[PDB]
Paper text:
KtrAB is a cation channel with a nucleotide-dependent [name] domain. The structure of the KtrAB complex revealed a homodimeric membrane protein (KtrB) assembled with a cytosolic [name] octameric ring, formed by the [name] protein. [name] binds nucleotides, ATP or ADP. ATP binding induces the adoption of a square-conformation by the octameric ring and increased K+ flux activity through KtrAB; ADP binding results in a non-square conformation and decreased flux.
As a control, we also analyzed the impact of mutating A80 since substitution with a bulkier side-chain was expected to cause a distortion of the nucleotide-binding site. As expected, [name] resulted in KtrAB inactivation. To understand the basis of these results we first verified that the [name] mutants [name] and E125Q retained the same basic properties of the wild-type protein. Both mutants assemble as octamers and are able to form a stable complex with KtrB, as revealed by size-exclusion chromatography. Crystal structures of the mutants that did not rescue the TK2420 growth phenotype ([name] and E125Q) reveal a different picture. The ATP-bound structures do not adopt a square conformation, displaying L1/L2 distances for [name] (at 3.9 Å resolution) of 52/23 Å and for E125Q (at 4.1 Å resolution and with two different half-rings in the asymmetric unit) of 34/30 Å and 42/27 Å. Importantly, this offset was not the result of the refinement procedure since the position of the residue is very similar to the one in the wild-type structure. It is obvious from the maps that adjustment of the main-chain position of the residue into the density would impinge on the ATP molecule, requiring a shift in the nucleotide position to avoid steric-clashes. We concluded therefore that the [name] mutation causes a distortion of the main-chain and leads to an alteration in the position of the ATP, impeding the adoption of the square conformation.
Author numbering:
A (entry chain C), B (entry chain D), C (entry chain F), D (entry chain E), E (entry chain A), F (entry chain B), ...: 6 to 222
The structure:
Amino acid sequence: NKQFAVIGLGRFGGSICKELHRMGHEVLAVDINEEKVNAYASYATHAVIANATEENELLSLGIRNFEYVIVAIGPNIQASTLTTLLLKELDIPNIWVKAQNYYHHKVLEKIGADRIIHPEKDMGVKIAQSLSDENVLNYIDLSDEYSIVELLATRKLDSKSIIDLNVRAKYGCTILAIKHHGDICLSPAPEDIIREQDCLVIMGHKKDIKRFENEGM
Amino acid sequence: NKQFAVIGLGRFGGSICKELHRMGHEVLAVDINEEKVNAYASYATHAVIANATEENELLSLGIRNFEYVIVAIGPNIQASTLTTLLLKELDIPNIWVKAQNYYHHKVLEKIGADRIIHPEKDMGVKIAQSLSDENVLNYIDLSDEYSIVELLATRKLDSKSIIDLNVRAKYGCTILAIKHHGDICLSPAPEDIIREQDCLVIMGHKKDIKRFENEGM
Amino acid sequence: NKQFAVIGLGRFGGSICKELHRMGHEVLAVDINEEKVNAYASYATHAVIANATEENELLSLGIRNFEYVIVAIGPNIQASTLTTLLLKELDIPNIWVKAQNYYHHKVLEKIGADRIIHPEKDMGVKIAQSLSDENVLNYIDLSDEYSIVELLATRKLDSKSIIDLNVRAKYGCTILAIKHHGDICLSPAPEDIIREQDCLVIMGHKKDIKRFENEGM
Amino acid sequence: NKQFAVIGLGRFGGSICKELHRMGHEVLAVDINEEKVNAYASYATHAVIANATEENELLSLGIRNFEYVIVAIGPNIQASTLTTLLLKELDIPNIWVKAQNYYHHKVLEKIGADRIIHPEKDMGVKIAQSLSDENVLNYIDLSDEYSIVELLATRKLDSKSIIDLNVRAKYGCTILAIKHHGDICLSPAPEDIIREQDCLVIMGHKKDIKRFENEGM
Amino acid sequence: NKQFAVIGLGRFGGSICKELHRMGHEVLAVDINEEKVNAYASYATHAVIANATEENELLSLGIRNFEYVIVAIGPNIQASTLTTLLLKELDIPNIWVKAQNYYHHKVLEKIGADRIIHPEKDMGVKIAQSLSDENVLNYIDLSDEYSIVELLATRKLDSKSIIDLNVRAKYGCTILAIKHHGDICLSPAPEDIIREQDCLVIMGHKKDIKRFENEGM
Amino acid sequence: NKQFAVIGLGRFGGSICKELHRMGHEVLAVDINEEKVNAYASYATHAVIANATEENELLSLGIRNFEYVIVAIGPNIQASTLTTLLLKELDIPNIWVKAQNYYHHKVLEKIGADRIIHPEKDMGVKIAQSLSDENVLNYIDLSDEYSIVELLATRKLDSKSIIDLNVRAKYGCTILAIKHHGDICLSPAPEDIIREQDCLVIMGHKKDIKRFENEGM
Amino acid sequence: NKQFAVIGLGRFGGSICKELHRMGHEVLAVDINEEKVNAYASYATHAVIANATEENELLSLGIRNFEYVIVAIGPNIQASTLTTLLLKELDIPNIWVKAQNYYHHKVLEKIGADRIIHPEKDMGVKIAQSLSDENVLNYIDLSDEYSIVELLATRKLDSKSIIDLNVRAKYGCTILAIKHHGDICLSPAPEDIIREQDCLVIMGHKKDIKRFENEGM
Amino acid sequence: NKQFAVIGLGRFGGSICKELHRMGHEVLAVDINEEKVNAYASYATHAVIANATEENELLSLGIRNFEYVIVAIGPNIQASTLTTLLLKELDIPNIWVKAQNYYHHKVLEKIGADRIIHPEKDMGVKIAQSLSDENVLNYIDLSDEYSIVELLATRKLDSKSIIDLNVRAKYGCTILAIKHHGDICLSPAPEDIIREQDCLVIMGHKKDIKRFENEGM
Ligand SMILES: Nc1ncnc2c1ncn2[C@@H]1O[C@H](COP(=O)(O)OP(=O)(O)OP(=O)(O)O)[C@@H](O)[C@H]1O
Ligand SMILES: Nc1ncnc2c1ncn2[C@@H]1O[C@H](COP(=O)(O)OP(=O)(O)OP(=O)(O)O)[C@@H](O)[C@H]1O
Ligand SMILES: Nc1ncnc2c1ncn2[C@@H]1O[C@H](COP(=O)(O)OP(=O)(O)OP(=O)(O)O)[C@@H](O)[C@H]1O
Ligand SMILES: Nc1ncnc2c1ncn2[C@@H]1O[C@H](COP(=O)(O)OP(=O)(O)OP(=O)(O)O)[C@@H](O)[C@H]1O
Ligand SMILES: Nc1ncnc2c1ncn2[C@@H]1O[C@H](COP(=O)(O)OP(=O)(O)OP(=O)(O)O)[C@@H](O)[C@H]1O
Ligand SMILES: Nc1ncnc2c1ncn2[C@@H]1O[C@H](COP(=O)(O)OP(=O)(O)OP(=O)(O)O)[C@@H](O)[C@H]1O
Ligand SMILES: Nc1ncnc2c1ncn2[C@@H]1O[C@H](COP(=O)(O)OP(=O)(O)OP(=O)(O)O)[C@@H](O)[C@H]1O
Ligand SMILES: Nc1ncnc2c1ncn2[C@@H]1O[C@H](COP(=O)(O)OP(=O)(O)OP(=O)(O)O)[C@@H](O)[C@H]1O
């Protein structure tokens, strides 16, 4: 299908490998720690003990063949950077590397990483957003001003109808989905009821959504 | 406003503190490492050097007053656990803790953590999704089966109309937004045109969205 | 008689199980590693392969029946903690747990471990005592100031009598036993002789015993 | 004073180093793990990062000068053995090594270890002894058969006199000390009273002490 | 005076250090190989064994103080690159690095090396020039086209005057110096004689000098 | 024309071969490594895979015919020596050999090498010279005391005339050339201007040139 | 036939493997250096890259099956000792080990090596014998006093008969063999002729043989 | 008597010097390592610290006077070669040099070494011989097919007579010597008895000797 190499079976890397394996892709799980290789042996096509900073080992893995290589090493800047460099000189098409800090990001950038990810930082931003606003369970920003938001329904919304809560005119936002007891309602009709503690999916302008949050719920 | 305590100024914790501070909330940035405290001094209300496992220091911080306390310590399972536990005995309303792996999650759960987060794991899943499918720029999962996806438009979608691409009937999914050259169109009418390289926001079942990606683009 | 459960057949745990079995007590030896179960099969009443963190397995062991359960898992803090906790919720009378370090000691303490042991640490202290003082073979502290000490006799003590070495008056300490060529003399009379390289058992104040070591031997 | 080298800052080794440093001896704490060196920097004279497996590094430490070298590495048999061998060829006077199992003990023995210690095993035996007999707080074995035991007094012993409990004739054992509310009585006269929950220090044959425990308390 | 750090005491680095030391400059000779440190101990102010890729060792050297740091490591691209990066982050004013190949040059360039040198390559070019033309003793290129050349005089030039050999008009080149039996004539007048086997210093265009070599000598 | 044999296509040897080929000479590129024969195939007349220590292969090359043979093997002292020796016994007119160190230089010297070169060492000296003195770009020593130096112009020299900087009288040195933006001025007249960052070519006594560097620029 | 394992393909080991292979025995050539494995690939049944100190690799070799295992590692005392120990614990029938010095010999002895060889030392003794006495080509000592010696015939022995050189009576020694131009004469009759430069095999007392060497040749 | 110079006191060289000294020859032991000079001071006439590659030191030794000079340096090819070369230019009659591998043998050969020895290799062949055939104690090859072998007698040979074991007719081989309890019997008569565990010296064809070994013992 498509070949993926996950170097560094951490939380992040391990998750990548496990999920990708669940999707049914050819995933090579590489780690210097034997116990990590042993741990993700069930969740990969081939799990190998290797020092990714050692070139001959990298050739012994046959990494040149892979379309995507992911360096999920993030506290050892040295190892990460070095590995990325090795892969670059070996003409790997796509090199995705975790990064630790702004300068590690810089060095990855300069040695030609294709995509640099900061999982902890981004998730930090998200969870902080959820912290300052208890109503938001999840969300996605369409742009600087427009967003789709998932909200936890309060008592103020219990037994209320979509036509009762006229968001499309009063607030310029549109409701997309209602999740009740695990059951799911997509693009619901105005007659539908929202019960408390249910998942509500609204879409619109950020400020408008906050307006609805304040006065509605 | 609302008082937040961020213990552990890593990428994740640091991001939480910085972002929350950008929102203009009272954020207490706590760290045992002096240089971290010095680093996030600009991005907090009060930045303090403290050993969060030492109770008398925790009383010296006056942590009982805070509505939300975030334990962003994730490689030192031990310290994290003790700290969370300390906060629990001190009757803190909301304790959100960063976890490393499943059993650390278990012990946090059992000592009564209010919310446990796995940033690296979740972001790993997301990036893996983006890896197996180059077309997805971003997304949000409404549930195990239903999701809203942001897609990068290919040439197959160039100059195509919403009524031309009948997703609501043929694939059971609904288009929510179109982003063209930075300009943004929310809940667009069937006459609207989609140009390649534009942002397309579809909503529906995961498998159905994959179907549309397959035959459509 | 009395029922004991030893979870974790390490050196320490294995020693507990083997020794208890030699005394003729009902000892259930539990381990996740099959080879450990096979190893201590001869030295237990019932040796079972079980994941002690998995509750249903813990019920399958019928651990609720046991008066004493010993968690001898010490490098995997997580397994130890989770297991100890499981036992606590199952209302086990006495839970003795092996600890690795101070904060793990803390979390064990707070989740209600009944007795926490640091074998390596304590034995370290003892062997260090023996290191700085080649004369001391072993000892037991009665209190902060008073102790019973086992000493290796030097040439200065060869062919010396108990009445000759008046410890009861000159140093306020009392000799308890003399071990000569494996032969043993308990509470010896003043006429008895001490030959070099023999075991001498003195009792008294620490500083006083040091005094006697200094001027006497 | 006297120079000590502690190689391997584990629980056991770390305890040795910390305790020895508390005694005010010159202790060189050596470890391959940087974080361990950093941890015990406060509890040593000189804390060095070194792989004790490399000879030139061992010369860089100047280990030939030390009277006592302690190999506190116990799960890595290879490293332990090798270090011990290196030290032996370097004509170190006293080499004390922590062992894991019987065969590692054998190889240490054959390559000329001066003293081999099994902390976990021995402490296991002790704790097992305390487990089968809740009454014993501590003890020291004078030989295979004779021992001095510290006992927790029960209700059966409350308000009883030493002459009342004639251990010297009825059981052939002798009482050495009584600890009451922290206060301490050494080699007490027959008129003295024992109150419950006090520390009792008996001396004699193992079987005899068990007998006294049985009928007496 | 000025402080120099030479990391990597190979031939190139060693020559740098030795020569600089001969000039009487403060030169810190750093090497991971003990024998190299021992070799250049006589030819430096301070010769230290250090792993230049290890940051804490680099701080232990106190390298931040130095005006010039030279990475003379050229077959280990890894070590060179890594070290250079470390020095850059430590805000070293001038970092001169020895390179192996074009891509190592590239990565050095991108991580901000101040001067990159290819000794073997350049000297290769020079020696090749001397190989195809047996007559040239030495030379210096002013530019791609213009150069000053030192020539060994043949019989065709014996007893010839500067005015006889009109290089300034016939070939557009100018003679700068004549070395006869060790005696030296700088900017000689047209009456001066050139005897064979003497050193002749001409200056001009490369082609013109070759022309003069061809028809003249 | 003239025939050259380059044995060992390293950086140095490869540079020799490539440069010689650019001049249009008959160059035989010999290497035991197939990939280097393949690499320099474009930059030679004939590129052959051969073991230069094997005599029959050397006869198969027909090396006796060549006027110049260059042994550019420098880390394998053995191969270098044996090869050079082979060539000597085969009565080769000119044998130029790359040397690694002083003693290899000795053995090459004694087995009758015609010219021995140390590229790394010499270039080391040069680059070191440039290191202690940022102002000098290049130079050539006419004798122990007299030299021609190429200098990088500073701000102190900007917009200054040759007659303004009277070097011929004030410092006894003479300016030979000025290189401005790649353009070149040979033996310039006193009216000419020197702009900063330009190449300046002075000629005279070493100490005098320094003097001029000191007070002038 | 019989199975041999040669670990360490040095001069000594490599020679063992090559010679053994020439005899047509099943020889497993094991080496950690890939190039050594590649070198002796032609001179073995199976040539494998393996770290003989790593147990799992040793099981991957299936070394338990072999009757004879030879540790030909001699400058790395560590590897030799460790490997030998591994083989011993794996119940290998015959373990022959190359030793470096007296103490390495000691540790090999104590860990139960079956045969310890010192090639350099022994050959040193032999070559020394040939050095002090130029006359001897080869020899074997039957005892402290009696020996069989191979001698290079001089001119004094040319065209001489066995009956002419009466060694059996005049010197008490006996001639055993004469080798002339590769042709061989075993236990030759008294009529036989010895020509110079031939191999002569005499047998007797050392001093007597020396006597014959002195007066005879 | 005869003057010998042993340069390089390793095992091989040291053995040479020691053995030569035991025979009572004038042996000059030369070494650059002071401790080796100190070590073999007792086993030489004159033991000197000298760098054998340095000519003036070689004249300071007065090596021109010696009939035999032995270069026993074998891992430092460079030093060995240069030294041998120095001795050659100094017109030394006999230069015997220890070689490492085939090419070092080549360079020694070509710079005119008189005798080149490979101790490890040859001894390798021998020990290999003994490895494939456990029966042989020692031997000497007269030619490719004919040999004299020393054998360890088994039980099959106990109390057997020479006439009983008719080797001269049945196997075409001849017995030369019998060594019993240190006592020695040369060219024994047919009545003589062979007891087990005695040394037996047979002579003949290799295959024939193996035949006798097979059916006979
Ligand atoms: N040079 C190397 N070659 C191969 N694998 C390596 C190398 N260095 C580190 N690794 C592996 O990469 C993994 C990266 O996880 P690490 O322990 O570095 O923390 P982390 O990745 O930041 O944590 P997480 O991924 O859980 O957030 C480790 O399991 C380690 O075994
Ligand atoms: N007991 C403690 N008390 C206070 N601060 C701590 C404690 N333990 C860790 N920290 C701080 O919390 C921060 C957490 O980041 P850390 O380096 O532990 O990796 P992480 O948090 O798993 O990864 P990330 O930095 O991406 O979140 C660290 O910078 C550390 O200084
Ligand atoms: N979750 C678990 N369930 C059951 N058994 C476990 C679990 N985790 C570890 N064990 C067992 O407990 C034993 C504990 O010994 P381990 O090797 O973990 O080191 P240790 O106990 O600190 O060292 P030692 O006991 O040798 O001093 C191990 O043999 C292991 O097989
Ligand atoms: N080759 C080596 N060289 C130097 N130090 C080492 C080497 N191998 C291990 N160590 C160090 O020695 C220490 C030994 O402790 P380790 O973690 O191996 O468990 P342990 O000693 O059995 O446990 P404990 O000492 O807590 O009972 C470790 O901290 C490790 O960093
Ligand atoms: N990580 C490191 N840290 C510090 N020093 C290092 C490191 N790696 C290599 N070196 C040193 O740098 C020097 C580089 O020389 P090396 O042996 O790599 O060959 P080289 O430099 O190509 O040889 P030459 O310079 O003579 O051409 C070595 O002497 C080595 O000891
Ligand atoms: N015996 C030999 N016969 C033929 N070619 C050889 C032999 N030995 C080495 N070579 C080749 O000669 C080339 C010389 O470069 P090498 O890698 O030996 O280092 P070097 O030449 O000292 O370094 P540089 O590349 O800077 O010149 C190598 O590419 C090697 O393949
Ligand atoms: N840990 C190991 N595991 C397997 N093989 C090893 C190990 N260590 C060394 N060897 C191999 O054993 C061989 C021993 O030869 P080495 O280079 O050590 O010199 P040596 O044996 O003294 O020289 P010689 O055998 O020529 O007398 C080497 O070829 C090496 O590759
Ligand atoms: N240039 C030199 N001048 C004098 N002595 C030297 C010189 N080079 C080496 N030696 C000495 O010669 C001795 C030879 O032993 P070396 O360490 O060279 O290994 P080796 O001789 O091959 O091994 P072994 O002799 O143990 O089989 C060394 O002890 C060394 O000190």
